[PDB]
Amino acid sequence: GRLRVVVLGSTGSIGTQALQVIADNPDRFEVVGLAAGGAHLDTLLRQRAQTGVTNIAVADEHAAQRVGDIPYHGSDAATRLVEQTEADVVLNALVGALGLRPTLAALKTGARLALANKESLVAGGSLVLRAARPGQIVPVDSEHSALAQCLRGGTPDEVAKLVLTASGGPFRGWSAADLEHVTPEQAGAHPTWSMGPMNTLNSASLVNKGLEVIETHLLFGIPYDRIDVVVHPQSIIHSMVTFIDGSTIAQASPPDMKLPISLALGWPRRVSGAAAACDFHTASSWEFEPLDTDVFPAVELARQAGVAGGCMTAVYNAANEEAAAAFLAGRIGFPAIVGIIADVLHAADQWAVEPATVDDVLDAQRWARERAQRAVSGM
Amino acid sequence: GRLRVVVLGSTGSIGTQALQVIADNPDRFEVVGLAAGGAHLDTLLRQRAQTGVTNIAVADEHAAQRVGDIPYHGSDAATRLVEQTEADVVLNALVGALGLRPTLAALKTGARLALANKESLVAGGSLVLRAARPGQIVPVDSEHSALAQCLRGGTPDEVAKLVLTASGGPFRGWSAADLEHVTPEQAGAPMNTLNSASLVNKGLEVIETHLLFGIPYDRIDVVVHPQSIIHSMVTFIDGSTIAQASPPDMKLPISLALGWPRRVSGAAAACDFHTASSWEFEPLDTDVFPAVELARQAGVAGGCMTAVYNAANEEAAAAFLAGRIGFPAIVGIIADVLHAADQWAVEPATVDDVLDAQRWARERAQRAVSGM
Ligand SMILES: O=C(c1ccccc1)N(O)CC[C@@H](c1ccc(Cl)c(Cl)c1)P(=O)(O)O
């Protein structure tokens, strides 16, 4: 009855919330593994003391002189923890490149993978899919969690459309001309040595939604031409599924990541009192409007990369990271982020091949960065 | 593959929409029987012509005399059609008291009952429930169709609340004082329309929801949603709500009731999320509209009380239409009648028990009218 949980990336926002859900629900879950990168050693050590969990890994080579009592440490040590720890669920909330090998290891163990790491699907693609059995991957992000719930409304042959909702970001309703000269600070993107500013930039870019469309295709096996994005400023409905008879099923909740986290951990069972429900005793309205795809071409560009397949989505994401970083640094204008991704992709025919190994994904990503760094440089 | 379908009340709105669904899906369904009152004989004869179905029932004896070719005629013609005809699904879209016996006949056959007759469950209560097996009654109403769909979102132990949406009728935001002056014309009256306006329809649907899904009344909520695009929602124990949405079109829940658990391709248009739209929610003004509160009271009391609730409504509704009482007196009289109905919390053993409750309720409502 009690599920054994490995929490990877335990010190970040997703990992800390998952540990609160588990602490609230010791009848349903027990923590059996923790992993974080060496920069987060002090917090990881606090978690060991608080959870009493000693099976912990420092997920990289860093803090190398302070790991004398850590059971796993070094490059790829989170993968080793996953390989060696009996569990029912691996929550992978590692950030970026770190997340890929532990995802692959988790799938090989036969455990459920509660996947928070975007890298795994966006870059890994068919590497990750070929390692998974049907139903083994359960998403942690609000939208994909919404979609997985709404897909319960019918059999696969009855699915007409998947509809992801999007806030539209801070430039919702702006013209191309309006966006020509915006600053990173106008996007709500301010410095911090984390993926925070990148994440907020991707939200302004609509690249966030592009990535979520890619993840949707891979998670649910629905063609790109049947994955739509709708703007919904309230973010109460987190996504919807439209079925062949005309019926749409939607999932709605006040924003709170503990809900989709709880569900991914307990899948298929829901977790009592994980989050607060919508209160239908106070007036509200849920608004929907089309995405302006002329102004925000990032989403259709993600579909184009996705349709090409293989390492093309790794290329899309890696080119975005470089271009977005350039925009953050004040080196390029806002429109050039997606302009650069498009340029890199146009040159990227060699990367439509499926990746044979992790190294092919890494090669595609290095190529894409180099290619994006060139585009940025002149300009 | 082909489900044989008996359509009761074939000439009404639901009936005709159902025939069109069946005609569009001959691989899925076949019409094998029709029943109507006879008021719209033109339609029935036209339906006989288009479907080829000669297996027909007519309530009116003088209207059946008009053709003299109808195998079933009289006050129980529909019931006798159900008893005789080999079917997989009986769609009962008969109106009012006409629907109860046919519902009982249908359940007795073992066929799925696609139920569009509110009276069956609301008045029939446990008598209808005792006649049914798990899953045999499949609701046609948009709200209950939505609920059944949203329940796929989890297991039964995970359900926190069922939330029915209500249009609010044309008198959203009106005071009791405002409602005093309402004419039949303003309330769109047309018994479903009046009930929509008075919120009694929602009251009835709350009772139906309890009896169909076995959720307690204190966990069946109503929210006002004027667009009627969200048709109902379920809130699960983890805080997640699952909602069903579509442009209002009965062909959707009709198709689903006939083909359950399988969906029917192209039954209805989907929401078009490429055009801007707004879905508004607001609480019901329960001071001005207590019909749902009253329905819960009747439901909790149980037995014949919901039969009393519905019959008092119909009498009071008739009085309002006749010009004998004002609009707020409809639900006012329902309350008065229910409050006098302590003796009626007894379980109905037979159809006559239900008819006795309804008689009592009609007479008590009339006495209240003769007061005002
Ligand atoms: O299920 C239905 C219905 C739905 C669509 C079309 C016709 C009837 N009804 O119960 C009719 C009354 C309900 C209703 C439902 C949908 C609409 Cl579009 C309207 Cl006007 C009224 P109510 O919320 O007022 O109680």
Ligand SMILES: [Mn+2]
């Ligand atoms: Mn998201």
Ligand SMILES: [Mn+2]
């Ligand atoms: Mn209804």
